[PDB]
Short mmCIF file of C-alpha atoms (C1' of nucleotides) in Angstrom, two decimals:
data_model
loop_
_atom_site.label_atom_id
_atom_site.label_comp_id
_atom_site.label_asym_id
_atom_site.label_seq_id
_atom_site.Cartn_x
_atom_site.Cartn_y
_atom_site.Cartn_z
CA UNK A 1 3.20 -24.49 23.03
CA UNK A 2 3.20 -24.23 26.81
CA UNK A 3 1.93 -21.57 29.27
CA UNK A 4 5.71 -19.43 29.36
CA UNK A 5 5.53 -19.52 25.46
CA UNK A 6 2.32 -17.79 24.94
CA UNK A 7 3.65 -14.96 26.90
CA UNK A 8 6.51 -14.78 24.98
CA UNK A 9 3.90 -13.99 21.82
CA UNK A 10 2.04 -11.85 24.10
CA UNK A 11 5.71 -10.25 24.83
CA UNK A 12 6.35 -9.71 20.81
CA UNK A 13 3.21 -9.11 19.14
CA UNK A 14 2.73 -5.99 21.86
CA UNK A 15 6.09 -4.79 20.80
CA UNK A 16 4.94 -5.18 16.82
CA UNK A 17 1.42 -2.81 17.67
CA UNK A 18 3.41 -0.38 19.24
CA UNK A 19 5.77 -0.45 16.68
CA UNK A 20 3.07 0.22 13.97
CA UNK A 21 1.44 3.20 16.54
CA UNK A 22 4.74 4.84 16.89
CA UNK A 23 5.78 5.02 13.18
CA UNK A 24 2.13 6.24 12.72
CA UNK A 25 2.68 8.87 15.11
CA UNK A 26 6.14 9.85 14.04
CA UNK A 27 4.44 10.35 10.46
CA UNK A 28 1.69 12.32 11.83
CA UNK A 29 4.59 14.63 13.95
CA UNK A 30 6.38 15.38 10.70
CA UNK A 31 3.04 16.93 9.00
CA UNK A 32 2.53 20.43 10.13
CA UNK A 33 -1.14 20.11 9.48
CA UNK A 34 -1.34 17.56 12.05
CA UNK A 35 1.33 17.18 14.25
CA UNK A 36 0.29 19.02 17.41
CA UNK A 37 -3.17 16.66 17.90
CA UNK A 38 -3.55 13.97 20.27
CA UNK A 39 -4.27 10.74 19.66
CA UNK A 40 -7.04 7.88 19.53
CA UNK A 41 -4.01 5.19 20.08
CA UNK A 42 -1.28 4.60 22.70
CA UNK A 43 1.78 6.10 21.39
CA UNK A 44 4.15 5.66 23.82
CA UNK A 45 -9.12 18.52 21.96
CA UNK A 46 -9.68 16.03 19.15
CA UNK A 47 -8.01 12.63 19.21
CA UNK A 48 -6.65 11.66 15.76
CA UNK A 49 -7.43 8.07 14.48
CA UNK A 50 -4.52 6.04 12.50
CA UNK A 51 -6.84 6.61 9.43
CA UNK A 52 -6.85 9.85 9.55
CA UNK A 53 -3.07 10.17 9.75
CA UNK A 54 -2.53 7.88 6.96
CA UNK A 55 -4.88 9.86 4.65
CA UNK A 56 -3.14 13.29 5.33
CA UNK A 57 0.18 11.54 4.64
CA UNK A 58 -1.15 11.33 1.54
CA UNK A 59 -2.56 14.63 1.21
CA UNK A 60 0.97 16.15 2.61
CA UNK A 61 3.37 14.46 0.29
CA UNK A 62 1.13 15.68 -2.63
CA UNK A 63 1.03 18.50 -1.41
CA UNK A 64 5.32 18.57 -1.58
CA UNK A 65 5.40 16.96 -4.80
CA UNK A 66 2.84 19.71 -6.19
CA UNK A 67 5.49 22.53 -4.84
CA UNK A 68 8.36 20.80 -5.78
CA UNK A 69 6.52 20.96 -9.43
CA UNK A 70 6.01 24.75 -8.65
CA UNK A 71 9.32 25.23 -7.40
CA UNK A 72 10.72 23.93 -11.08
CA UNK A 73 8.41 26.06 -12.81
CA UNK A 74 9.51 29.17 -10.72
CA UNK A 75 12.72 28.38 -11.75
CA UNK A 76 12.42 28.16 -15.13
CA UNK A 77 10.52 31.26 -15.69
CA UNK A 78 13.26 32.71 -13.35
CA UNK A 79 16.12 31.71 -15.68
CA UNK A 80 14.16 32.29 -18.85
CA UNK A 81 13.30 36.07 -17.55
CA UNK A 82 17.62 36.60 -16.51
CA UNK A 83 18.04 35.21 -20.12
CA UNK A 84 16.02 37.93 -21.80
CA UNK A 85 17.73 40.58 -19.76
CA UNK A 86 21.01 39.37 -20.95
CA UNK A 87 19.97 39.33 -24.32
CA UNK A 88 18.06 42.51 -24.40
CA UNK A 89 21.41 44.24 -22.79
CA UNK A 90 23.89 42.30 -25.23
CA UNK A 91 22.01 43.20 -28.61
CA UNK A 92 21.03 46.85 -27.59
CA UNK A 93 24.40 48.60 -28.73
CA UNK A 94 23.64 46.44 -32.07
CA UNK B 1 -22.61 -12.83 22.89
CA UNK B 2 -24.27 -14.42 19.93
CA UNK B 3 -23.60 -15.89 17.04
CA UNK B 4 -24.89 -13.71 14.28
CA UNK B 5 -23.57 -10.65 16.09
CA UNK B 6 -20.25 -12.59 16.24
CA UNK B 7 -20.87 -12.88 12.77
CA UNK B 8 -20.92 -9.09 11.92
CA UNK B 9 -18.59 -7.89 14.84
CA UNK B 10 -15.75 -9.75 12.14
CA UNK B 11 -17.25 -8.90 8.52
CA UNK B 12 -16.80 -4.90 10.26
CA UNK B 13 -13.22 -5.34 12.02
CA UNK B 14 -12.16 -7.47 8.29
CA UNK B 15 -13.25 -4.27 6.68
CA UNK B 16 -11.54 -1.56 9.48
CA UNK B 17 -8.62 -3.59 8.61
CA UNK B 18 -8.42 -3.85 4.80
CA UNK B 19 -8.87 -0.28 5.18
CA UNK B 20 -5.80 0.61 7.16
CA UNK B 21 -3.92 -1.62 4.40
CA UNK B 22 -5.48 0.20 1.64
CA UNK B 23 -4.11 3.15 3.47
CA UNK B 24 -0.97 2.02 3.71
CA UNK B 25 -0.68 0.67 0.45
CA UNK B 26 -1.36 3.95 -0.84
CA UNK B 27 1.20 6.09 1.15
CA UNK B 28 3.74 3.51 -0.61
CA UNK B 29 2.06 4.01 -3.92
CA UNK B 30 2.83 7.65 -3.83
CA UNK B 31 6.36 7.10 -2.77
CA UNK B 32 8.39 6.66 -5.91
CA UNK B 33 11.22 5.26 -3.34
CA UNK B 34 8.93 2.18 -2.91
CA UNK B 35 5.58 2.59 -5.11
CA UNK B 36 6.42 -0.31 -7.53
CA UNK B 37 7.44 -2.54 -4.85
CA UNK B 38 4.84 -5.92 -4.00
CA UNK B 39 3.50 -5.89 -0.56
CA UNK B 40 3.84 -8.03 2.23
CA UNK B 41 0.06 -7.71 3.11
CA UNK B 42 -3.36 -8.12 1.45
CA UNK B 43 -4.56 -4.73 0.08
CA UNK B 44 -8.58 -5.08 -1.25
CA UNK B 45 -7.88 -4.21 -4.49
CA UNK B 46 11.43 -10.56 -5.59
CA UNK B 47 10.58 -9.62 -1.40
CA UNK B 48 7.62 -7.48 -0.56
CA UNK B 49 7.27 -4.75 1.57
CA UNK B 50 5.92 -4.80 5.01
CA UNK B 51 4.07 -1.84 6.88
CA UNK B 52 6.59 -0.67 8.82
CA UNK B 53 8.92 -0.17 5.95
CA UNK B 54 6.38 1.89 4.09
CA UNK B 55 5.97 3.98 7.20
CA UNK B 56 10.07 4.71 7.97
CA UNK B 57 10.31 5.49 4.34
CA UNK B 58 7.48 8.00 4.03
CA UNK B 59 8.64 9.76 6.88
CA UNK B 60 12.12 9.70 5.12
CA UNK B 61 10.91 10.96 1.99
CA UNK B 62 8.61 13.31 3.60
CA UNK B 63 12.18 15.30 5.48
CA UNK B 64 14.01 14.78 1.86
CA UNK B 65 11.22 17.19 0.64
CA UNK B 66 10.96 19.58 3.48
CA UNK B 67 14.46 19.44 2.77
CA UNK B 68 14.79 20.24 -0.50
CA UNK B 69 12.48 22.69 -0.40
CA UNK B 70 15.00 24.56 1.51
CA UNK B 71 17.14 24.20 -1.62
CA UNK B 72 14.38 25.34 -4.00
CA UNK B 73 13.94 28.50 -1.97
CA UNK B 74 17.58 29.58 -2.22
CA UNK B 75 17.77 28.61 -5.83
CA UNK B 76 14.84 31.04 -6.47
CA UNK B 77 16.44 33.98 -4.20
CA UNK B 78 19.53 33.69 -6.12
CA UNK B 79 17.89 34.01 -9.31
CA UNK B 80 15.80 36.62 -8.36
CA UNK B 81 18.84 38.41 -7.24
CA UNK B 82 20.32 38.15 -10.26
CA UNK B 83 17.44 40.12 -11.58
CA UNK B 84 17.42 42.24 -9.26
CA UNK B 85 21.06 43.39 -10.37
CA UNK B 86 20.18 42.95 -14.02
CA UNK B 87 17.60 45.16 -13.41
CA UNK B 88 19.23 48.59 -11.80
CA UNK B 89 21.34 48.93 -14.45
CA UNK B 90 18.68 49.22 -16.92
"C1'" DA C 1 13.34 -16.93 17.99
"C1'" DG C 2 11.76 -12.92 16.26
"C1'" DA C 3 9.11 -10.27 12.79
"C1'" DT C 4 4.78 -10.31 10.48
"C1'" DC C 5 0.54 -9.96 9.12
"C1'" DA C 6 -3.99 -13.05 9.43
"C1'" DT C 7 -8.07 -14.02 12.47
"C1'" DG C 8 -11.69 -13.75 16.82
"C1'" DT C 9 -13.16 -11.59 20.33
"C1'" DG C 10 -13.79 -7.62 24.90
"C1'" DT C 11 -13.91 -2.55 25.16
"C1'" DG C 12 -15.60 2.00 25.37
"C1'" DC C 13 -16.73 5.67 22.78
"C1'" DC C 14 -20.89 8.36 19.28
"C1'" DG D 1 -32.44 -3.78 18.90
"C1'" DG D 2 -25.09 -0.19 15.68
"C1'" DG D 3 -20.87 1.55 13.86
"C1'" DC D 4 -15.83 3.09 15.03
"C1'" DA D 5 -12.11 2.34 16.37
"C1'" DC D 6 -8.69 0.18 19.42
"C1'" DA D 7 -6.68 -3.60 22.32
"C1'" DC D 8 -5.69 -7.98 23.25
"C1'" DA D 9 -4.76 -12.82 22.79
"C1'" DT D 10 -4.26 -16.66 19.52
"C1'" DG D 11 -2.57 -19.42 14.90
"C1'" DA D 12 -0.09 -19.28 10.41
"C1'" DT D 13 4.24 -18.65 8.18
"C1'" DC D 14 8.58 -17.26 6.86
"C1'" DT D 15 13.07 -16.32 7.76
#
DNA sequence: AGATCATGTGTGCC
DNA sequence: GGGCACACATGATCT
């Protein structure tokens, strides 16, 4: 556990910490609600903190999960409406 | 710089660290690709998910979902136009 | 070795 | 006479 060796942890662990920061920033940058903002932290006029990015990430996913429910509902409504038109048209002469 | 206010600074930092871990765990819990796994870290609540894994997956899963909406949009357009084209018959 | 996560610190902004 | 985020540098553990 010499002087060479503690410099080798503080190389490894610094990387762990900017590795986390960059993943947090990448996540911020695909969320259109917060993508443009500057950050409280070193990635490598309001500053976004790690908590807020992580909170918004969860909300932004609920939003996309919601939208998928709405899309699978929209689809069913439209397929349903196509069905009723095809029936009405098939059975009018009858 | 003193025993009682040392003590307090840590009390604080522990809470900050558990807030970040709980937020990461929530982000995990909403991503069905990873939601039911174990965690490498303490939440304030056989191999364990790590922080960066949850972060990478959250980005993977948001791209997936954004990409699917484009497919959903197309499915909707194809249907709306199939309706257009039945109704112009009357 | 190398990654990871937990613990104390010191710093700087509100 | 305060809390906060964040960075840093260690210690402990696991592959």
